[PDB]
Short mmCIF file of C-alpha atoms in Angstrom, two decimals:
data_model
loop_
_atom_site.label_atom_id
_atom_site.label_comp_id
_atom_site.label_asym_id
_atom_site.label_seq_id
_atom_site.Cartn_x
_atom_site.Cartn_y
_atom_site.Cartn_z
CA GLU A 1 69.78 111.37 82.30
CA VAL A 2 73.52 111.84 82.76
CA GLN A 3 75.33 108.50 83.00
CA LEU A 4 79.04 107.95 83.66
CA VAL A 5 80.38 104.38 83.60
CA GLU A 6 83.92 103.54 84.70
CA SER A 7 85.74 100.42 83.55
CA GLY A 8 89.24 98.98 83.48
CA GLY A 9 89.55 98.27 87.20
CA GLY A 10 90.94 95.03 88.51
CA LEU A 11 94.11 93.48 89.87
CA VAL A 12 97.71 94.67 89.58
CA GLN A 13 100.90 94.20 91.55
CA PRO A 14 103.05 96.96 93.09
CA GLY A 15 104.95 98.81 90.38
CA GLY A 16 102.49 97.63 87.72
CA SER A 17 100.21 99.61 85.44
CA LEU A 18 96.54 99.67 84.47
CA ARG A 19 94.38 102.01 82.39
CA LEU A 20 90.90 103.20 83.39
CA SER A 21 88.14 104.28 81.03
CA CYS A 22 84.97 106.31 81.55
CA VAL A 23 82.19 106.58 78.96
CA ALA A 24 79.71 109.45 79.21
CA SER A 25 76.11 109.40 77.98
CA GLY A 26 73.07 111.64 78.22
CA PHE A 27 74.82 114.97 77.55
CA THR A 28 77.26 116.74 75.24
CA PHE A 29 80.51 115.36 76.65
CA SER A 30 82.67 117.74 74.59
CA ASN A 31 81.33 120.80 76.46
CA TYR A 32 82.15 119.64 80.00
CA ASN A 33 85.20 119.61 82.24
CA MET A 34 85.75 116.27 83.95
CA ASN A 35 87.42 114.84 87.05
CA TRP A 36 88.86 111.62 88.42
CA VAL A 37 88.19 111.03 92.12
CA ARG A 38 88.97 107.95 94.19
CA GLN A 39 88.08 106.68 97.66
CA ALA A 40 90.22 104.12 99.49
CA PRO A 41 88.50 101.66 101.85
CA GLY A 42 87.66 103.43 105.09
CA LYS A 43 88.94 106.79 103.85
CA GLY A 44 87.51 110.05 102.56
CA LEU A 45 87.17 111.23 98.99
CA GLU A 46 90.44 112.22 97.31
CA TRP A 47 90.52 114.27 94.12
CA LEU A 48 93.09 113.01 91.62
CA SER A 49 93.03 114.83 88.29
CA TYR A 50 91.15 117.43 86.25
CA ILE A 51 90.90 117.96 82.49
CA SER A 52 89.11 120.69 80.59
CA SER A 53 86.85 119.98 77.62
CA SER A 54 89.60 120.92 75.14
CA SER A 55 92.37 119.15 77.14
CA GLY A 56 94.11 122.54 77.33
CA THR A 57 94.02 122.62 81.15
CA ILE A 58 95.06 119.66 83.31
CA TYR A 59 95.55 119.46 87.08
CA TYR A 60 97.05 116.69 89.20
CA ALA A 61 97.16 115.97 92.90
CA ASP A 62 100.63 115.62 94.39
CA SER A 63 99.81 112.07 95.51
CA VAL A 64 99.51 110.94 91.86
CA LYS A 65 101.65 113.54 90.06
CA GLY A 66 104.15 111.95 87.70
CA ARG A 67 102.49 108.52 88.03
CA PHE A 68 98.97 109.05 86.65
CA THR A 69 97.96 110.49 83.28
CA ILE A 70 94.54 111.90 82.38
CA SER A 71 93.24 112.22 78.82
CA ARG A 72 90.00 112.22 76.87
CA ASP A 73 88.54 111.52 73.42
CA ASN A 74 85.52 113.74 72.76
CA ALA A 75 84.60 111.82 69.60
CA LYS A 76 84.26 108.66 71.73
CA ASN A 77 82.60 110.51 74.65
CA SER A 78 85.28 108.98 76.86
CA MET A 79 87.94 109.84 79.43
CA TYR A 80 90.96 107.88 80.63
CA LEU A 81 93.28 107.57 83.62
CA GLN A 82 96.60 105.85 82.85
CA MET A 83 97.99 104.64 86.19
CA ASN A 84 101.68 103.72 86.38
CA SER A 85 103.97 102.91 89.31
CA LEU A 86 100.99 101.70 91.31
CA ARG A 87 101.34 101.27 95.07
CA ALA A 88 99.30 99.42 97.68
CA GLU A 89 97.88 102.74 98.90
CA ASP A 90 96.39 103.28 95.42
CA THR A 91 93.88 100.52 96.21
CA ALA A 92 90.55 102.34 95.98
CA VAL A 93 87.31 102.75 94.08
CA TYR A 94 87.91 105.16 91.20
CA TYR A 95 85.11 107.53 90.24
CA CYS A 96 84.41 109.46 87.05
CA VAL A 97 82.97 112.89 87.86
CA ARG A 98 81.38 115.54 85.64
CA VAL A 99 82.36 119.11 86.53
CA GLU A 100 79.57 121.59 85.83
CA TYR A 101 80.46 125.30 85.89
CA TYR A 102 77.55 127.61 86.73
CA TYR A 103 77.85 131.41 86.50
CA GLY A 104 75.10 132.62 88.81
CA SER A 105 74.30 135.84 90.62
CA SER A 106 76.50 135.10 93.66
CA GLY A 107 79.58 134.13 91.67
CA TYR A 108 81.02 131.38 89.50
CA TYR A 109 81.28 127.92 91.01
CA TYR A 110 81.96 124.27 90.27
CA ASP A 111 79.40 121.51 90.79
CA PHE A 112 80.47 117.85 90.83
CA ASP A 113 76.95 117.00 89.75
CA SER A 114 77.41 113.48 88.31
CA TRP A 115 79.35 110.53 89.73
CA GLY A 116 79.67 107.08 88.24
CA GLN A 117 79.29 103.91 90.27
CA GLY A 118 83.08 103.56 90.24
CA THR A 119 85.49 100.73 89.52
CA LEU A 120 87.63 98.89 92.06
CA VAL A 121 91.42 98.79 91.72
CA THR A 122 93.48 96.53 93.99
CA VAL A 123 97.27 96.79 94.16
CA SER A 124 98.80 93.77 95.88
CA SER A 125 101.14 90.84 95.38
CA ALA A 126 98.45 88.36 96.46
CA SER A 127 96.86 85.98 93.95
CA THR A 128 93.13 85.51 93.45
CA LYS A 129 91.80 83.00 95.98
CA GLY A 130 88.34 81.80 96.95
CA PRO A 131 87.30 82.09 100.59
CA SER A 132 87.04 79.38 103.20
CA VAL A 133 83.65 79.56 104.93
CA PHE A 134 83.65 78.38 108.55
CA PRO A 135 80.55 78.20 110.76
CA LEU A 136 79.95 80.24 113.90
CA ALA A 137 77.67 77.68 115.52
CA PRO A 138 75.08 78.66 118.14
CA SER A 139 76.19 77.24 121.47
CA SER A 140 76.23 77.85 125.22
CA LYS A 141 78.54 80.82 124.59
CA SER A 142 75.74 82.51 122.58
CA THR A 143 73.67 83.75 125.52
CA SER A 144 70.41 85.65 125.08
CA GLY A 145 66.86 85.57 126.38
CA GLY A 146 65.00 83.53 123.78
CA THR A 147 67.39 84.40 120.93
CA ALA A 148 70.66 82.92 119.69
CA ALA A 149 73.67 84.27 117.79
CA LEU A 150 75.04 82.46 114.74
CA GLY A 151 77.14 83.40 111.75
CA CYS A 152 79.72 82.44 109.15
CA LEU A 153 83.45 83.19 108.93
CA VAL A 154 84.52 84.15 105.40
CA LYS A 155 88.30 83.89 105.68
CA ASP A 156 91.38 84.17 103.45
CA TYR A 157 90.07 85.45 100.12
CA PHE A 158 91.38 87.89 97.52
CA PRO A 159 90.32 90.28 96.24
CA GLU A 160 87.29 92.23 97.39
CA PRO A 161 84.37 91.88 97.34
CA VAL A 162 82.22 88.99 98.53
CA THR A 163 78.44 88.82 98.87
CA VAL A 164 76.82 87.09 101.84
CA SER A 165 73.15 86.20 102.31
CA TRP A 166 71.26 83.87 104.63
CA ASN A 167 68.80 81.19 103.48
CA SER A 168 69.16 82.50 99.91
CA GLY A 169 67.74 85.86 100.99
CA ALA A 170 64.87 84.73 103.22
CA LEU A 171 66.52 85.65 106.54
CA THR A 172 67.12 89.41 106.42
CA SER A 173 66.19 90.68 109.90
CA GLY A 174 68.99 90.88 112.44
CA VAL A 175 71.70 90.12 109.87
CA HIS A 176 75.02 91.92 110.34
CA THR A 177 77.74 91.52 107.69
CA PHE A 178 80.91 93.22 108.90
CA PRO A 179 83.34 95.11 106.65
CA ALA A 180 86.26 92.94 105.60
CA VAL A 181 89.68 93.32 107.21
CA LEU A 182 92.98 92.98 105.35
CA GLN A 183 95.17 90.40 107.07
CA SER A 184 98.96 90.55 107.14
CA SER A 185 98.96 87.64 104.66
CA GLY A 186 97.43 89.96 102.06
CA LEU A 187 94.11 88.08 102.12
CA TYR A 188 90.77 89.49 103.23
CA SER A 189 88.49 88.14 105.95
CA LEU A 190 85.05 89.09 107.25
CA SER A 191 82.26 87.60 109.36
CA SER A 192 78.48 87.73 108.90
CA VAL A 193 76.35 87.05 111.98
CA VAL A 194 72.60 87.00 112.59
CA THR A 195 70.47 86.85 115.74
CA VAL A 196 67.40 84.60 115.52
CA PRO A 197 65.01 83.21 118.15
CA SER A 198 66.78 80.46 120.09
CA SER A 199 63.62 78.33 119.98
CA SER A 200 64.11 77.98 116.20
CA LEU A 201 67.56 76.35 116.37
CA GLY A 202 66.08 72.89 115.94
CA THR A 203 63.20 74.06 113.76
CA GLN A 204 64.92 76.10 111.04
CA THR A 205 68.16 75.28 109.23
CA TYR A 206 70.28 78.38 108.62
CA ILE A 207 72.60 78.43 105.59
CA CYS A 208 74.93 81.29 104.62
CA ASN A 209 75.46 81.90 100.89
CA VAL A 210 78.96 83.18 100.07
CA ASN A 211 79.73 84.26 96.50
CA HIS A 212 83.20 85.40 95.38
CA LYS A 213 83.01 86.35 91.70
CA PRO A 214 86.76 87.03 91.16
CA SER A 215 87.58 83.39 91.98
CA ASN A 216 84.32 81.92 90.60
CA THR A 217 83.77 80.46 94.08
CA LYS A 218 80.27 79.89 95.49
CA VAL A 219 79.80 78.23 98.89
CA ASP A 220 76.58 77.42 100.76
CA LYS A 221 77.37 76.35 104.34
CA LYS A 222 74.76 75.33 106.91
CA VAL A 223 75.46 76.43 110.49
CA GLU A 224 74.72 73.40 112.67
CA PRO A 225 73.74 74.27 116.27
CA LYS A 226 75.95 73.03 119.10
CA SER A 227 73.98 70.90 121.57
CA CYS A 228 76.16 71.80 124.58
CA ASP B 1 98.93 120.46 97.82
CA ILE B 2 96.89 122.65 100.16
CA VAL B 3 96.04 120.74 103.35
CA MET B 4 92.41 120.53 104.52
CA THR B 5 91.61 119.66 108.14
CA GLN B 6 88.11 118.84 109.39
CA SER B 7 86.97 118.35 112.98
CA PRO B 8 85.50 116.26 114.31
CA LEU B 9 85.54 113.02 112.31
CA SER B 10 82.29 111.71 113.84
CA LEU B 11 79.53 114.02 115.09
CA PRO B 12 76.53 112.49 116.89
CA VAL B 13 73.62 114.93 116.67
CA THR B 14 70.14 114.62 118.14
CA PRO B 15 67.46 115.26 115.49
CA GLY B 16 65.95 118.72 115.86
CA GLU B 17 69.09 120.23 117.42
CA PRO B 18 71.79 122.33 115.74
CA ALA B 19 75.15 121.07 114.51
CA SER B 20 78.36 122.65 113.21
CA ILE B 21 81.43 121.29 111.41
CA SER B 22 84.83 122.99 111.26
CA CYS B 23 87.22 123.04 108.30
CA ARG B 24 90.77 124.40 108.49
CA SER B 25 93.00 125.34 105.56
CA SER B 26 96.79 125.27 105.38
CA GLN B 27 96.75 128.65 103.61
CA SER B 28 94.20 131.39 103.06
CA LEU B 29 91.38 130.70 100.60
CA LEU B 30 90.25 134.35 100.46
CA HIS B 31 90.98 136.05 97.13
CA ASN B 32 89.31 139.22 95.80
CA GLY B 33 86.50 138.97 98.35
CA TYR B 34 85.71 135.32 97.53
CA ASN B 35 86.41 132.34 99.79
CA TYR B 36 87.31 129.41 97.52
CA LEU B 37 85.84 126.66 99.68
CA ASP B 38 82.87 124.36 99.01
CA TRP B 39 80.93 121.91 101.19
CA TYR B 40 79.76 118.51 99.92
CA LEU B 41 77.54 115.85 101.48
CA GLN B 42 77.76 112.13 100.65
CA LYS B 43 74.66 110.36 101.95
CA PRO B 44 74.77 106.58 102.57
CA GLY B 45 74.77 104.83 99.21
CA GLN B 46 74.49 108.10 97.26
CA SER B 47 76.74 110.30 95.16
CA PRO B 48 78.23 113.45 96.72
CA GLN B 49 76.08 116.55 96.28
CA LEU B 50 76.91 120.26 96.33
CA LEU B 51 75.70 122.07 99.46
CA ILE B 52 77.70 125.31 99.79
CA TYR B 53 79.81 127.13 97.21
CA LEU B 54 82.15 130.11 97.61
CA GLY B 55 82.10 129.72 101.39
CA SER B 56 78.59 130.85 102.28
CA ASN B 57 76.26 130.40 99.26
CA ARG B 58 73.69 127.60 99.22
CA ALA B 59 73.38 125.57 96.03
CA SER B 60 70.05 125.26 94.24
CA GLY B 61 67.49 123.29 96.25
CA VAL B 62 69.51 123.16 99.49
CA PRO B 63 67.31 123.84 102.54
CA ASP B 64 67.65 126.93 104.72
CA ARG B 65 68.93 124.76 107.59
CA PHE B 66 72.35 124.55 105.92
CA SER B 67 74.63 127.57 106.14
CA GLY B 68 78.32 128.32 105.66
CA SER B 69 80.56 130.93 107.26
CA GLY B 70 84.22 131.74 107.77
CA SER B 71 87.11 133.43 106.03
CA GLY B 72 90.74 132.84 105.16
CA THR B 73 91.65 129.55 106.83
CA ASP B 74 88.75 128.96 109.27
CA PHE B 75 85.35 127.90 107.93
CA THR B 76 82.22 126.46 109.53
CA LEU B 77 79.27 124.55 108.11
CA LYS B 78 76.22 124.87 110.37
CA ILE B 79 72.86 123.08 110.40
CA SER B 80 70.26 125.00 112.41
CA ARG B 81 67.88 122.02 112.66
CA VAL B 82 69.25 118.54 111.92
CA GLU B 83 66.79 116.20 110.19
CA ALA B 84 67.08 112.43 109.93
CA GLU B 85 67.88 112.71 106.20
CA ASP B 86 71.09 114.68 106.90
CA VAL B 87 73.20 111.69 107.98
CA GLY B 88 76.31 111.08 105.92
CA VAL B 89 79.85 112.33 105.42
CA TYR B 90 80.30 116.09 105.01
CA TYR B 91 83.38 117.22 103.09
CA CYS B 92 84.88 120.66 102.65
CA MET B 93 86.68 121.19 99.35
CA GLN B 94 89.21 123.89 98.56
CA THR B 95 89.00 125.34 95.04
CA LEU B 96 91.82 127.91 95.14
CA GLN B 97 94.18 125.21 93.79
CA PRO B 98 91.73 122.63 92.40
CA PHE B 99 91.14 120.44 94.16
CA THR B 100 91.50 119.15 97.74
CA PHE B 101 88.90 117.45 99.94
CA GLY B 102 88.97 117.35 103.72
CA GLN B 103 88.96 114.20 105.82
CA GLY B 104 85.17 114.33 106.10
CA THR B 105 82.81 114.52 109.08
CA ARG B 106 80.31 111.67 109.46
CA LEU B 107 77.09 113.06 110.91
CA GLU B 108 75.52 110.30 113.00
CA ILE B 109 72.29 109.88 114.94
CA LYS B 110 72.64 110.58 118.66
CA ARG B 111 70.53 108.25 120.80
CA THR B 112 70.32 106.79 124.29
CA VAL B 113 73.25 104.71 125.51
CA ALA B 114 72.95 101.00 124.72
CA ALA B 115 74.56 97.86 126.15
CA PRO B 116 76.42 95.47 123.82
CA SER B 117 75.23 91.86 123.90
CA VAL B 118 78.56 90.02 123.94
CA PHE B 119 78.99 86.61 122.31
CA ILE B 120 81.97 84.38 121.54
CA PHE B 121 82.41 81.60 118.97
CA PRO B 122 85.08 78.88 119.30
CA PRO B 123 86.99 77.86 116.16
CA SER B 124 85.12 75.41 113.95
CA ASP B 125 86.49 71.88 113.61
CA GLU B 126 86.76 72.42 109.85
CA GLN B 127 89.18 75.30 110.49
CA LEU B 128 91.25 73.38 113.05
CA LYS B 129 91.78 70.68 110.41
CA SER B 130 93.43 73.40 108.28
CA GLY B 131 96.01 74.33 110.93
CA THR B 132 94.50 77.65 112.05
CA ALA B 133 92.07 78.76 114.75
CA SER B 134 89.92 81.91 114.82
CA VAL B 135 87.88 82.99 117.85
CA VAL B 136 85.25 85.66 117.15
CA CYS B 137 84.08 88.12 119.80
CA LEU B 138 80.79 89.83 118.93
CA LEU B 139 79.42 93.11 120.29
CA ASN B 140 75.87 93.46 118.96
CA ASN B 141 73.69 96.59 118.96
CA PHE B 142 75.50 99.05 121.21
CA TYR B 143 75.98 102.82 121.39
CA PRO B 144 78.20 104.79 121.11
CA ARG B 145 80.94 103.43 118.83
CA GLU B 146 83.59 103.60 121.56
CA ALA B 147 84.36 100.11 122.88
CA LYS B 148 87.55 98.39 124.04
CA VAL B 149 87.94 94.68 123.29
CA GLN B 150 90.97 93.06 124.91
CA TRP B 151 91.78 89.41 124.22
CA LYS B 152 92.96 87.54 127.32
CA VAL B 153 94.32 83.99 127.08
CA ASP B 154 95.19 82.41 130.44
CA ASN B 155 94.76 85.94 131.86
CA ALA B 156 97.57 87.14 129.57
CA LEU B 157 97.15 90.35 127.56
CA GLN B 158 97.27 89.56 123.85
CA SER B 159 98.54 92.13 121.36
CA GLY B 160 99.07 92.33 117.61
CA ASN B 161 97.08 89.15 116.90
CA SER B 162 93.48 90.45 116.75
CA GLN B 163 91.55 92.53 114.23
CA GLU B 164 88.51 94.74 114.75
CA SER B 165 85.61 95.68 112.47
CA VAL B 166 82.58 97.90 113.08
CA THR B 167 79.40 98.12 111.01
CA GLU B 168 77.74 101.31 109.83
CA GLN B 169 75.12 102.94 112.04
CA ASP B 170 71.86 101.04 111.59
CA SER B 171 69.16 102.75 109.54
CA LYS B 172 66.39 101.85 112.02
CA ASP B 173 67.98 101.25 115.44
CA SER B 174 70.83 103.77 114.96
CA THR B 175 73.22 101.31 116.61
CA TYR B 176 76.58 99.74 115.78
CA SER B 177 78.10 96.26 115.88
CA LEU B 178 81.70 95.20 116.50
CA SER B 179 83.61 92.05 115.55
CA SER B 180 86.96 90.98 117.03
CA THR B 181 88.70 87.95 115.51
CA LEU B 182 91.63 86.40 117.38
CA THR B 183 93.73 84.34 114.95
CA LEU B 184 96.17 81.76 116.29
CA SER B 185 97.94 78.71 114.93
CA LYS B 186 96.55 75.31 115.89
CA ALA B 187 99.73 74.59 117.87
CA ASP B 188 99.42 77.82 119.87
CA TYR B 189 95.69 77.18 120.27
CA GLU B 190 96.32 73.68 121.65
CA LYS B 191 98.86 75.09 124.14
CA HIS B 192 96.52 77.31 126.20
CA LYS B 193 93.36 76.74 128.23
CA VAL B 194 91.00 79.69 128.86
CA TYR B 195 90.07 82.20 126.15
CA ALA B 196 88.04 85.35 126.74
CA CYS B 197 87.41 88.85 125.40
CA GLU B 198 86.98 91.66 127.93
CA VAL B 199 84.55 94.34 126.74
CA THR B 200 84.70 97.90 128.08
CA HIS B 201 81.79 100.25 127.40
CA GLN B 202 79.92 103.08 129.09
CA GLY B 203 76.62 101.21 128.72
CA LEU B 204 78.04 98.59 131.09
CA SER B 205 78.36 98.90 134.85
CA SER B 206 81.82 97.30 134.76
CA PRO B 207 83.95 95.54 132.10
CA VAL B 208 81.81 92.55 131.13
CA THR B 209 83.75 89.39 130.25
CA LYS B 210 82.61 86.48 128.07
CA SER B 211 84.73 83.33 128.14
CA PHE B 212 84.82 79.72 126.99
CA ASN B 213 86.94 76.67 127.72
CA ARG B 214 88.85 74.87 124.97
CA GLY B 215 87.45 71.48 124.00
CA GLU B 216 83.88 71.97 125.18
CA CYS B 217 81.06 71.78 122.64
#
């Protein structure tokens, strides 16, 4: 099968630089035009750059023109995106895309037929920081007929992402993990809630597992019910 | 670059009923009888896939439900019968000056109106010991997405101190969930009495309010 794998993503401050790499497997890379496409959080896909197989044709989007440089090494089955003068709005997942060019009966057309899993690039002045996990205890304010609402508050971490589970993966029904928001401090914050039967507040202990790989932080916090 | 404009951004469709998405171009994409515009679909957790090429031609393996039309600067992607597997973000892409995507139209499941179960969580004592206080308003399993959450402290209208977050449409219930977090310093939190979030939705008879008193519990 066709497999594109991006690497080189990570952290950088405004004005800084970082170089992305994409390795291609499962096909003759030297016979294919290729693309770089990114997607910022909560935004649509944005094409960035194009390069032909022979590097003789290169296109750039105006948003990255003069700041980003595309190139490729067919002997190494690889493609690169040199990113300079990075800005906060360049924070996105960057995708490596194969551009197939069919010549059918109805006319010639492109087909972006292979996308890698992407690599995350964050442009910010913030430093890497593990999250603080605060409980959202079930209480009188959590009102429901036979069910209760509880969760955890994953606050003030950088960068994305974090993974949240409940009871090490046992509790999966009714779990809602919200998309993180970027606070004015430059740190991220999200909440993960779950609705469980209120008659199980004394019976079952509910623990939220928060893992933040960039900071090597791993927190398991039990949400104690409020007896009011 | 050439500017691509899609409308709407979210399109609730009932399964079995038609649906159409518009795409506008800043300049004409017609050249020598060909319309240089393609339509892509990005399903949840999947890579984008080619649907329509050259304006009106279906790619290999694309069902007859999908169809493209238009010319110059106005183009339309139409689905005669929307299936449940068609949810996702639909993009139009101009290829006259490669390349430019549109904003994208998220096709969502249209269902009966639902009422949000509103909850509120006071700041944990562990967080108060760190000098900050966060109150979380929770709107669980409602429909549609539209919902107004206003934070009222001592019946005063707060502004610029809350943040909102909405989950993706559920795969089984086809519902949403909203989270509003009011962040205040411990000093400002210990200077006021009543905290509440006022929820406004069409599934409610009138703006439902959930409140709590500082200190309790």
